[PDB]
Structure 1
Amino acid sequence: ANPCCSNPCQNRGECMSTGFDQYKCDCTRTGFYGENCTTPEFLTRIKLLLKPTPNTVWYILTHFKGVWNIVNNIPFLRSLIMKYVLTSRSYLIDSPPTYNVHYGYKSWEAFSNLSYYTRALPPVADDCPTPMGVKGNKELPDSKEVLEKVLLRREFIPDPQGSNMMFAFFAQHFTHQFFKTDHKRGPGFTRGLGHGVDLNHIYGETLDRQHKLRLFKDGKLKYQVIGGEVYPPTVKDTQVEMIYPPHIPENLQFAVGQEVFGLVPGLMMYATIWLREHNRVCDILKQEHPEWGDEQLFQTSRLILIGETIKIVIEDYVQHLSGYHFKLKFDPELLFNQQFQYQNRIASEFNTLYHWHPLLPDTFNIEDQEYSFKQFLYNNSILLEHGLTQFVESFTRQIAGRVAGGRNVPIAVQAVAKASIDQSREMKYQSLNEYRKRFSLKPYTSFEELTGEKEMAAELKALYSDIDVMELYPALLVEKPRPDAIFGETMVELGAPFSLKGLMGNPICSPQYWKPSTFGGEVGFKIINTASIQSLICNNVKGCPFTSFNVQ
């Protein structure tokens, strides 16, 4: 019924109904005009020829390594390029946010209600004839069939980029502070009202939860010592609610910021490391400020660990998966002379892109042991058995699975991979090509172009019939990977804008926050600016084991 169901407006134009069977496109500041905003203005036509393809920019950044060696050592030039990286990506994000799962039009409810994930593209109207709008059949192909044919893992396909389990669990740990779906309300809702990197997975979402976790001495968080090693406190000691099976002994019920981090020892490993990092920073700040109280020591340490997290994510984590030879740089000053909104709203699609199920291995290999999913889940006894040192060394060695390329989703999490499909449909997501156009990508003309091969493409064509009906999430996992890369084009070109906007949109990156006094002086400021995944492990894990996000 809705005349906008066909998504007629192009180039980020906005569609509005002007009757029961008529519409109008708002071409304001899109650079285009005409009925569907497809006729480019003069300046627009120029940029279309100048601006390079994303597979060209990716090529430049991931090749000419000898040239980048020169550029990386020229601070002026390095800053110039990183500046362009930050600005060009964040331009794709609406800020302040617009739509959510319940509003395909702008409204104060959509803006003000922080319980929603926001949406980069509006939901398909409920009164639309087809799930994608007007194209396709009355119902999308069976999600179980999509899963089994092109998603489920036959043989384990390792990541050619060499991403290890330190990378895998970091991603899971890091993103679970702003991906906290409120399953009581629905998949389009979140419990992470900070909508960013606030480290609530360490300190707790609520003030009540934070105080139960705090020692209230020297700004530190509560902890316990087991075998001479520092571990998180227990549920019994702090009364913070955690998610554990009833058969789990209460001395193994560790209490941390995020309630689900008891799920896997890999998450509990990072929770422990970050816990130690907080208290380490407390000691350092106390050395500098003996006149400071517990409260200021805590708050300043939290701001410092936020800085470290963003530092590490940009210069280690993102640096790895991007495959760039350009040396990425966390420098908030790069945006001080730029137009930039220091705010963020977590997008539903960003959460969907981050469903990296194929990343998981078939077994979790710690030391000489090889644990199954059943043995690994909710089993912190494994962590106490081997220790953090053995955990880091083992996870540094074990490679992770390739995400793009198809058929690499471990069958142990098939219900989870199917939920992504189902829930994406439940949230009325628009098609793959709609999202590609939204982020300046050309639509795929065939399933073969999408997969880069023949077999899976044929399988998908039997299911979806039309390429313009192809869903976003399963397309990410079967997409033709970039040359020896872990991802396809869609994953990176869509995800980077959400990521960098979330990282740089943090208030500590703003000019009034980004100064030594915010972090207790130059000493605390230096902790942020010299942070790395290696130094994080070195300072907090016994023996200072070598670590990295790739296998050696």
Structure 2
Amino acid sequence: PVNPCCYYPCQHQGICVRFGLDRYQCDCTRTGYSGPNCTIPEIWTWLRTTLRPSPSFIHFLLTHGRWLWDFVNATFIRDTLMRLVLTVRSNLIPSPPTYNIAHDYISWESFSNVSYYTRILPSVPRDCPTPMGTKGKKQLPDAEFLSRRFLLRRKFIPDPQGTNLMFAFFAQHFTHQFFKTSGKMGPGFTKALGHGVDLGHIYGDNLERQYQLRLFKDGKLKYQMLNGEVYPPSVEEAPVLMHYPRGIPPQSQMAVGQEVFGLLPGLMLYATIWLREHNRVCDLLKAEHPTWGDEQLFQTARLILIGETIKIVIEEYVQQLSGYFLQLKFDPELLFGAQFQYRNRIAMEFNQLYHWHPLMPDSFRVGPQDYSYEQFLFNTSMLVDYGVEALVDAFSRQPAGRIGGGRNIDHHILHVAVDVIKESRVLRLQPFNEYRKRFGMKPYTSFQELTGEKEMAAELEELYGDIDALEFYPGLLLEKCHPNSIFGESMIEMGAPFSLKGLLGNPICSPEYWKASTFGGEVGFNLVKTATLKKLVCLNTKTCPYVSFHVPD
């Protein structure tokens, strides 16, 4: 007989378990539903469904009416809604984590082995009639053809929200601490064992690397003085594994936490900033505690930087991304009266979701100059040539592309998106519509409804066959955006649960850790509480340039 779990019969987070030769069962425990497929609502669930307004309506509320949002932000209601946003989003994410690439069920190996990426939905069973489950054709559309006809940028479509490259290089820098897909272990495995905001892109994913980057004096990391400016040390000074083109002199090579950060001047930009901040923090701690050893000066500074990161990510990064009129607030105290797990494991779907390559432009403007991909990529001198001030100013001024909408990835880095779809099929991700149902959305009934247009939608119908066969990453990028927004509903409704759970899931946000002593008295605590992007750059640079996640207009 055929595998019945290929039909995804279990609704609203119910678990499909195969019993006997030809039967199956759904485990509807705490799903809010009863019945063989978990489609029969309990009194409380029915009372919530016909009173829950559509995700588009709630977006509309958050993006309109400046007058009432000014009132809300200046009252207690700011905290109420921030607590509401945090809980409701994160409660979609299983914690402790549930499945992985090896196991489409709960196991001890899935809990303990942190080298795995986790998954919210199980993979499409290996014995299903069609690659995506039961719907569609026996062979999925060509990955290269799909990227060429639907993802390749014709003309540059700029982001309507005013997102800049300063955001884009932050987005890449920040995420590369919890996205480190293994080379030797293959797909579904991660080198980033911290599984979140651990700053292993600054300190490293292991102790051997960390010790090698540390100066072991005053808690600082090693550095070099070039033209009177502070930069990460050379590989000769800090002998760590760094990915560079075979030939580049070791004098030009810079040693940082993440191995791929020397490839782009934008990545090595922030790496330099955070390094300068770390030592600046250490100087504030050594004054406060002159009896403190190097190790305490180091570890305490790290936690401050971790706190600063989450502060800026929530209140500035996610703020610009969402375009919400609600002034987002980083306050761990909000979740102290609630049932919240202070742990996090990175999901593969989040890894797939965060591929925001449409952000990258056609070229890179630095003042009167205009640098192409073949001038900007692997360039080692640029960062030192222009300096931190001059580059931050240029990245904060240049607009980034629109993520959603489709056909917005520059031809250079299109190969990446091709791999993402190929990787998706190795991982055996479920269809787009099943992830829609998992995140409390209605599945798309037609290809028309996904893209919101006639032409590109009708072409996909011919290639996929059935809408319930549309793939995870294509669906996300092909979906119509919100009125004047950077992407569609799915990117918000699916990404936020992963995102906010990752931020507030950090142990520093727990009642046990969120104390003044953790950060070395009140000084270190205020450093977290009052951190800003503007403060992160200018308190570490000679002059103060234009710095923001949005273009100046």
- Equivalents in 2 of 1:499, 1:254: separation in Å? 30
Name 2:25's counterpart in structure 1.
24
Q: Does 1:79 align with 2:103?
A: no
- Per-residue CA deviations over 1:119-177 (Å, capped at 9, x if unaligned) read 01100111112111111111111111111111100001000011000000000000000
Name 2:122's counterpart in structure 1.
122
Q: Does 1:202 align with 2:196?
A: no
Amino acid at match of 1:550: H
SS at match of 1:265: coil
Name 2:34's counterpart in structure 1.
33
Decide whether the 8 Å contact of 1:150 with 1:459 is kept in 2.
no
Amino acid at match of 2:230: V
Name 2:350's counterpart in structure 1.
350
Name 1:291's counterpart in structure 2.
291
Decide whether the 8 Å contact of 1:353 with 1:473 is kept in 2.
yes
Q: Give the drift of 1:20.
A: 2.2
- Equivalents in 2 of 1:520, 1:42: separation in Å? 50
- Equivalents in 2 of 1:294, 1:110: separation in Å? 37
Amino acid at match of 2:173: H
Q: Does 1:511 align with 2:523?
A: no
Q: Does 1:363 align with 2:359?
A: no
- Equivalents in 1 of 2:3, 2:186: separation in Å? 25
Name 1:60's counterpart in structure 2.
61
Amino acid at match of 1:418: V
- Equivalents in 1 of 2:366, 2:421: separation in Å? 32
Q: Does 1:410 align with 2:404?
A: no
- Equivalents in 1 of 2:387, 2:208: separation in Å? 30
**Where in structure 2 are the equivalents of 1:385-534 lying within 5 Å?**
385-534=385-534
- Per-residue CA deviations over 1:472-516 (Å, capped at 9, x if unaligned) read 101111110000000100011000000100100111000111010
Amino acid at match of 1:389: E
- Equivalents in 1 of 2:81, 2:48: separation in Å? 19
Name 2:303's counterpart in structure 1.
303
Amino acid at match of 1:65: R
456-465 or 523-532: bigger deviation: 456-465
Amino acid at match of 1:481: C
Amino acid at match of 1:67: L
Name 1:211's counterpart in structure 2.
211
- Equivalents in 2 of 1:88, 1:422: separation in Å? 32
- Equivalents in 1 of 2:223, 2:277: separation in Å? 12
- Per-residue CA deviations over 1:240-283 (Å, capped at 9, x if unaligned) read 11000012121211000001101100000000000000000000
TM-score normalised by the chain length of structure 1? 0.99
- Equivalents in 1 of 2:314, 2:286: separation in Å? 28
Would you identify which runs of 4 or more consecutive aligned residues in structure 1 move more than 6 Å?
none
Name 2:183's counterpart in structure 1.
183
Decide whether the 8 Å contact of 1:3 with 1:20 is kept in 2.
no
- Equivalents in 2 of 1:264, 1:168: separation in Å? 12
SS at match of 1:190: coil
SS at match of 1:252: coil
Decide whether the 8 Å contact of 1:146 with 1:460 is kept in 2.
no
TM-score normalised by the chain length of structure 2? 0.99
- Equivalents in 1 of 2:315, 2:536: separation in Å? 13
Q: Give the drift of 1:433.
A: 0.4
Q: Give the drift of 1:183.
A: 2.4
SS at match of 1:317: helix
Q: Give the drift of 1:377.
A: 1.3
Amino acid at match of 2:427: M
Decide whether the 8 Å contact of 1:32 with 1:38 is kept in 2.
yes
- Equivalents in 2 of 1:453, 1:379: separation in Å? 41
- Equivalents in 2 of 1:41, 1:294: separation in Å? 58
- Equivalents in 2 of 1:167, 1:532: separation in Å? 13
**Where in structure 2 are the equivalents of 1:240-251 lying within 5 Å?**
240-251=240-251
541-550 or 495-504: bigger deviation: 541-550
- Equivalents in 1 of 2:14, 2:370: separation in Å? 53
Amino acid at match of 2:473: Y
Q: Does 1:97 align with 2:97?
A: yes
- Equivalents in 1 of 2:250, 2:341: separation in Å? 45
- Equivalents in 2 of 1:189, 1:89: separation in Å? 25
139-148 or 428-437: bigger deviation: 139-148
Q: Give the drift of 1:546.
A: 2.3
- Equivalents in 1 of 2:496, 2:215: separation in Å? 38
- Equivalents in 2 of 1:20, 1:55: separation in Å? 43
- Equivalents in 2 of 1:96, 1:320: separation in Å? 30
SS at match of 1:461: helix
- Equivalents in 1 of 2:157, 2:101: separation in Å? 35
- Equivalents in 2 of 1:211, 1:251: separation in Å? 20
Name 1:381's counterpart in structure 2.
381
Decide whether the 8 Å contact of 1:135 with 1:468 is kept in 2.
yes
- Unaligned segments of structure 1, at least 5 residues: none
SS at match of 2:306: helix
Q: Give the drift of 1:284.
A: 0.6
SS at match of 1:397: coil
Decide whether the 8 Å contact of 1:308 with 1:527 is kept in 2.
yes
- Equivalents in 2 of 1:175, 1:227: separation in Å? 31
Decide whether the 8 Å contact of 1:160 with 1:402 is kept in 2.
yes
* Equivalent residues, number: 551
SS at match of 2:17: strand
454-463 or 477-486: bigger deviation: 454-463
- Unaligned segments of structure 2, at least 5 residues: none
Q: Give the drift of 1:36.
A: 0.8
- Equivalents in 1 of 2:407, 2:211: separation in Å? 45
- Equivalents in 2 of 1:527, 1:334: separation in Å? 19
Amino acid at match of 2:468: D
Amino acid at match of 1:14: I
Q: Give the drift of 1:545.
A: 1.4
- Equivalents in 2 of 1:135, 1:30: separation in Å? 25
